[PDB]
Structure formats: C-alpha cells, structure tokens
Amino acid sequence: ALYEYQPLQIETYGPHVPELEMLGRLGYLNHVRAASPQDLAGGYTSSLACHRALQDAFSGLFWQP
Amino acid sequence: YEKLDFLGEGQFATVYKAIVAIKKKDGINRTALREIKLLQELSHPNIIGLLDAFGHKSNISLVFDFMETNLEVIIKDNSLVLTPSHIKAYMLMTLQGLEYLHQHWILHRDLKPNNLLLDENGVLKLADFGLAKSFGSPYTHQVVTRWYRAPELLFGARMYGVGVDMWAVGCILAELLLRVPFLPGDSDLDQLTRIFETLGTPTEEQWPDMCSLPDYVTFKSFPGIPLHHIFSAAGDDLLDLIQGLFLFNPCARITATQALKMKYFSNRPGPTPGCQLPRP
Amino acid sequence: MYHNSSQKRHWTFSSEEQLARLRADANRKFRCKAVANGDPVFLEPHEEMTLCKYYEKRLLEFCSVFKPAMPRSVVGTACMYFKRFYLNNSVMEYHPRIIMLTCAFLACKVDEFNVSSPQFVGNLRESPLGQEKALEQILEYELLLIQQLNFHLIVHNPYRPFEGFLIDLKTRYPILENPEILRKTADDFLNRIALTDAYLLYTPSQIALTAILSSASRAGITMESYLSESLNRTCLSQLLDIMKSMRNLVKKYEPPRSEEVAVLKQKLERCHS
Numbered sequence: 001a002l003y004e005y006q007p008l009q010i011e012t013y014g015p016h017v018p019e020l021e022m023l024g025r026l027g028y029l030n031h032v033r034a035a036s037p038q039d040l041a042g043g044y045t046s047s048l049a050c051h052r053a054l055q056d057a058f059s060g061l062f063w064q065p
Numbered sequence: 066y067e068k069l070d071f072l073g074e075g076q077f078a079t080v081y082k083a084i085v086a087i088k089k090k091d092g093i094n095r096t097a098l099r100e101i102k103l104l105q106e107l108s109h110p111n112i113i114g115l116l117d118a119f120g121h122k123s124n125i126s127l128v129f130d131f132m133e134t135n136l137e138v139i140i141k142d143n144s145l146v147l148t149p150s151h152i153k154a155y156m157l158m159t160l161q162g163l164e165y166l167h168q169h170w171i172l173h174r175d176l177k178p179n180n181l182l183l184d185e186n187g188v189l190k191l192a193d194f195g196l197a198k199s200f201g202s203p204y205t206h207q208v209v210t211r212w213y214r215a216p217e218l219l220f221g222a223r224m225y226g227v228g229v230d231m232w233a234v235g236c237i238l239a240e241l242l243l244r245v246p247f248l249p250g251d252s253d254l255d256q257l258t259r260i261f262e263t264l265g266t267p268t269e270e271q272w273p274d275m276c277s278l279p280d281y282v283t284f285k286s287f288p289g290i291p292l293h294h295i296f297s298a299a300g301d302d303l304l305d306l307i308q309g310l311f312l313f314n315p316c317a318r319i320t321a322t323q324a325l326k327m328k329y330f331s332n333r334p335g336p337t338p339g340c341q342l343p344r345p
Numbered sequence: 346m347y348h349n350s351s352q353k354r355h356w357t358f359s360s361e362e363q364l365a366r367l368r369a370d371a372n373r374k375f376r377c378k379a380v381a382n383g384d385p386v387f388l389e390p391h392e393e394m395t396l397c398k399y400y401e402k403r404l405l406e407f408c409s410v411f412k413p414a415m416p417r418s419v420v421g422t423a424c425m426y427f428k429r430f431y432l433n434n435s436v437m438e439y440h441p442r443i444i445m446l447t448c449a450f451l452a453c454k455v456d457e458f459n460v461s462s463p464q465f466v467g468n469l470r471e472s473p474l475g476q477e478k479a480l481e482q483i484l485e486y487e488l489l490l491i492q493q494l495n496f497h498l499i500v501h502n503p504y505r506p507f508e509g510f511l512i513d514l515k516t517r518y519p520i521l522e523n524p525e526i527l528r529k530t531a532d533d534f535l536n537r538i539a540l541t542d543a544y545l546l547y548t549p550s551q552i553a554l555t556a557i558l559s560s561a562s563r564a565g566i567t568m569e570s571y572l573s574e575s576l577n578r579t580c581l582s583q584l585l586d587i588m589k590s591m592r593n594l595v596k597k598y599e600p601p602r603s604e605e606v607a608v609l610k611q612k613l614e615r616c617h618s
C-alpha cells in the first residue's frame with residue numbers, strides 16, 4: 001500500500017538532455033541570458049530557459065514517420 | 066450526443082451532461098481556444114481529457130469526460146471526515162497531474178478545490194485550463210483566485226514558474242487539514258497581510274529579491290504562528306511538506322517532483338486507493 | 346512536447362507521394378461534387394499546388410509587415426495551418442486569400458499574441474468597407490479552418506530546436522569556435538525548407554540540425570564528430586539519409602512563375618465567380 005516514487009517514462013526519440021540541477025556546472029548557463037533580479041524574485045531562472053531549449057533541440061531527432 | 070441534464074453555467078460557457086460533459090467581433094472565444102490547444106497535446110490519467118470538439122458559427126462545444134464532483138464539495142461537506150490517508154491520496158493525484166503538466170512546460174495557474182474534479186472511481190483530474198499557459202520563455206500577475214495566490218504574484222510578479230502552482234497546492238493542502246480556507250483575504254493588501262500574520266513577514270534571507278517586485282511595499286514584521294500550532298494534528302513529515310510548499314522564496318519552494326520524492330508520501334500509511342475515496 | 350504531440354502523430358507523413366495522393370483526392374472530390382451540382386474551368390492538382398505556393402508567399406508577406414510586431418512562432422504556425430488546410434481541401438472551393446488571412450487570425454489567437462480584430466484588419470491594405478468585409482469573411486471561415494485542422498492547433502516549429510542546438514554547440518563542441526556564425530546562413534536554409542513540403546515529412550529538430558549542418562558545410566567546416574561523439578551506426582545512417590532527403594527536397598524546389606500564376610489566378614476566379 002506504500003507509495004513509491006517512479007519517474008515518468010516518456011520516450012523522446014533523441015539524445016539525452018542533462019538535468020536542470022546540472023546545467024550550471026556543465027557550462028550551459030554560460031551561453032544563455034542571465035535572469036534579472038526581478039525575474040528571480042518571481043521564481044524565474046535561466047536554467048529553465050536553457051533546459052527547455054535543449055529539450056526542444058533533442059526531441060524526436062531519431063524518429064522516422 | 067443526446068442531452069441528459071443541465072450541469073451548470075459559467076462566465077465563458079455553459080456545461081451540460083450528454084456519458085460526457087459538453088461545454089459551449091473578436092471571433093471564437095480565446096479561453097475556449099486555449100483549452101482546445103492545451104488539452105489536445107496532453108494525455109495523463111490526472112488531467113481532464115478533451116474527447117472531441119465541434120461548433121457552429123462563432124461558437125464551439127467541447128466534449129469532456131463526465132466528472133462526478135470536485136475537491137471543494139468534499140472540503141465543504143460536514144458529514145465526511147478526511148483521514149490522513151485521504152489527504153495523502155488527493156495530494157498524490159494532484160501532484161502527479163501537476164508533475165506531468167510541468168514536465169511539458171505548462172502552468173495551470175488556476176488551482177483551487179473546485180478546479181480539482183473527481184471521477185466516480187475516485188480519480189482526480191486537473192480541469193479548467195482556460196487560464197493555463199506554457200512557461201519557460203524569457204504574463205499577468207492577476208491570476209489564481211486571491212485566496213490561493215502566491216505572495217510573488219500578489220507582489221506583482223511578471224515572470225514566474227511552477228511556484229505559483231505549488232503555493233496554491235499548499236493552500237489546498239491547508240484547506241484539507243482545517244476544512245476552511247487558509248488565508249481568506251478580501252483584497253491584495255489584505256491577502257498579503259493575512260499571509261504575513263500567519264506565516265510571518267519574510268526577511269531578505271528567506272527571499273533575497275523581495276524589494277525587486279514592482280507591487281512590493283514594506284510591511285511591519287510579524288511573529289508568524291508556528292506551523293505545528295496552526296496544523297496541530299499533523300505529523301512531522303506533513304509539516305516538512307507544508308513548510309516546503311509554503312516557502313516564501315519561489316526558487317526554494319519545492320517542485321512537484323521534489324514533493325513527490327519527500328518522505329510524507331513514502332511513509333506509512335499509504336494513500337487511500339481511488340475506489341475507496343469518500344463520495345459526497 | 347513534440348515527441349508526443351499531434352503534429353508528430355497525425356501531420357508527419359512518410360513520403361511526398363502520399364501528400365500528392367491526398368491533394369489529388371481533394372481535387373477529384375471537388376470535381377465530383379461540382380459535376381454533381383450540374384470542363385475546361387477545372388484546375389489540375391499541380392496548378393493547385395502552384396497557386397498554394399504563391400499564396401504561401403502572400404501569407405509570408407502579410408505577416409512580415411504586420412503591426413504590432415508578430416513573433417516568428419505565429420508566422421510559422423500560420424504557414425503550417427495553410428499547408429495543413431490545403432492538404433485535404435481545394436483552392437477551387439475555399440479561396441486561398443481568405444484562408445491565409447484566417448490562418449493568420451487563428452495563429453495570432455492560438456499563439457497568445459493578443460491582438461484585437463480592428464487592428465488585425467487594419468493591417469490589410471484595403472478600404473474600411475473592404476476591411477469590414479474581410480473581417481466578416483475571416484469570422485465566417487475561422488470555424489471551418491479549425492475543423493479542417495482536426496482541432497490540432499499547437500504547431501512545433503524548428504526555431505526553439507535551433508536555439509537549443511546552438512546552445513549545445515557552444516557548450517560541448519569546442520572544435521567549432523563561434524557557433525553563432527552558423528546562425529545566419531542556417532536561418533536562410535530554414536526559410537527555404539519552409540517553402541518545400543518538409544514541414545509535413547520530418548521533425549523540427551531534424552530540420553534545425555539539417556540547416557545547421559548545411560550552413561557548416563557551406564562555410565567549409567565539418568561536424569561529423571558532433572553527430573558521432575557528442576550526439577549507433579544505423580541511427581547515424583538514418584540521420585544522414587534524412588539530411589540528404591532534406592537537401593534534395595530543397596534543391597528540387599522551383600518557385601512559381603509569374604505568367605503561370607496569373608493564368609491560374611484568372612482560372613481560379615472563373616471557378617469562384
């Protein structure tokens with residue numbers, strides 16, 4: 001009856017995307033626009049933008065219709 | 066589709082029971098277009114599914130799975146007790162729906178007990194996607210019912226993230242433990258005052274960039290009531306979850322995946338099976 | 346996300362032969378309905394494709410000077426709407442001009458580019474009576490356009506994949522110095538890929554990567570190691586074959602000629618009148 005976390009299993013048909021918490025220390029955030037402090041007040045970070053851009057770049061790259 | 070019953074009337078449309086629920090110059094209404102465009106690209110057991118859409122002239126009708134009730138009817142009901150297991154089950158269904166939604170970069174932005182519809186088999190789905198918007202591109206702060214609006218939104222946040230949903234989730238969690246709205250403000254100022262008089266007035270250490278919000282004004286400091294005093298009968302894991310959901314810093318506030326990975330859901334007891342959830 | 350979108354499922358096709366089959370089916374269905382209604386006035390499917398390409402260019406020109414400034418996402422969505430509509434419908438039933446204006450209207454609304462109807466129809470270079478008439482036609486055809494799209498309104502463009510690929514190249518490919526050089530020329534290639542049928546045949550990530558690699562090859566730079574190392578030999582061969590098909594599609598494309606388009610325009614007006 002105990003719940004157990006299992007991550008969502010969604011096939012992307014493309015290369016693996018590095019996780020959000022690892023983008024800064026891998027050098028990705030060095031090539032994206034830095035969030036202004038007003039953005040940071042509301043919870044906006046450049047990590048989200050970089051993550052979404054990479055996920056779009058890698059989504060369905062090895063898929064054939 | 067043969068109509069069976071009248072279900073309700075909304076600001077933008079009207080819902081009848083056909084078994085499905087059918088919801089019916091600028092042109093086609095933009096809320097309907099938004100619901101159509103967002104519910105077609107999603108498929109999760111905890112998100113309301115759009116079955117088919119059709120209309121006439123400048124009006125359209127959307128077909129949805131029929132929903133027996135919502136969380137607000139359960140909360141306001143007085144003949145049913147809400148055990149910790151039921152609260153955990155509702156919380157789990159809400160958080161898995163929200164995790165799937167956030168993974169696809171969508172903010173619901175209208176989370177409240179009425180927008181959390183419940184199947185006849187005890188399955189919870191997030192509904193009313195008329196305010197939902199995709200997030201993650203470098204918005205209006207007048208979103209979310211005021212009783213569930215986050216302090217960043219009340220302070221005039223333009224760009225935000227999943228936190229504006231999570232705060233509402235926290236509010237909903239509170240409404241499940243006390244059976245009454247947690248922070249029932251009348252205006253933006255009153256809502257902020259109640260937030261600060263219950264949870265304290267955050268400093269710069271709890272929120273490094275408070276004073277950067279355009280609608281931010283300085284409030285007097287408050288000795289916020291301790292959460293174990295507010296939620297007396299709750300447990301330590303539940304208190305940690307509440308503290309994570311009600312953190313003033315939106316970046317530090319727990320996400321849906323982080324909340325699902327907390328010990329509150331893993332600890333005994335397990336969530337109540339959907340077929341055994343209470344029915345009004 | 347694209348990898349579970351409706352565009353991948355219902356609007357990506359295995360071959361352009363199937364696309365031609367759908368267009369011919371539409372043309373012959375209109376012909377049968379017309380002859381049932383009670384000839385040299387009809388148009389062949391290749392002529393319909395010529396007119397469709399001409400009016401896709403017209404939609405591009407309409408969106409390029411639109412005020413307030415229209416984001417690239419709205420334009421791409423409108424053009425994909427036009428292509429999807431005229432896959433299963435004929436230009437001799439629904440006029441392409443009203444259809445492209447309705448495509449722009451619906452794209453603006455769906456993309457969350459909030460613009461009111463009066464300022465949208467003020468962008469048309471017509472008289473106020475003509476603008477009101479155009480608005481009326483657009484409002485008439487909005488629901489029909491939505492129905493012909495099967496209520497699939499979210500369109501995945503290659504612009505965000507392009508940005509993500511550039512970020513990844515800046516981070517993980519130090520062999521290529523200044524990846525931003527590729528931004529311009531690859532952009533050009535993207536434009537050309539928009540004019541062909543590739544938007545219905547492939548994925549946005551593949552289009553973006555094809556544009557980037559074509560720009561690099563034109564610049565005199567190889568990025569095979571990017572695909573092999575940074576990015577399975579069978580998978581690599583599949584990707585290279587997809588890229589080759591992309592380049593062949595862009596090479597074989599021919600713009601519509603002025604005289605042919607004028608003849609087709611008078612013929613189409615005769616069909617509508």
Ligand SMILES: CC(C)c1cnn2c(NCc3ccccc3)cc(NC[C@H]3CCNC[C@@H]3O)nc12
Pocket residue numbers: 072073075080086087088113129130131132133134135138179180182192193
């Ligand atoms: C349109 C779709 C999401 C839907 C499916 N079932 N259902 C029901 N069922 C009747 C009901 C609901 C809640 C409590 C008692 C009875 C009512 C209803 N009312 C329309 C709005 C009202 C405000 N809250 C969200 C609802 O969708 N919308 C729907």
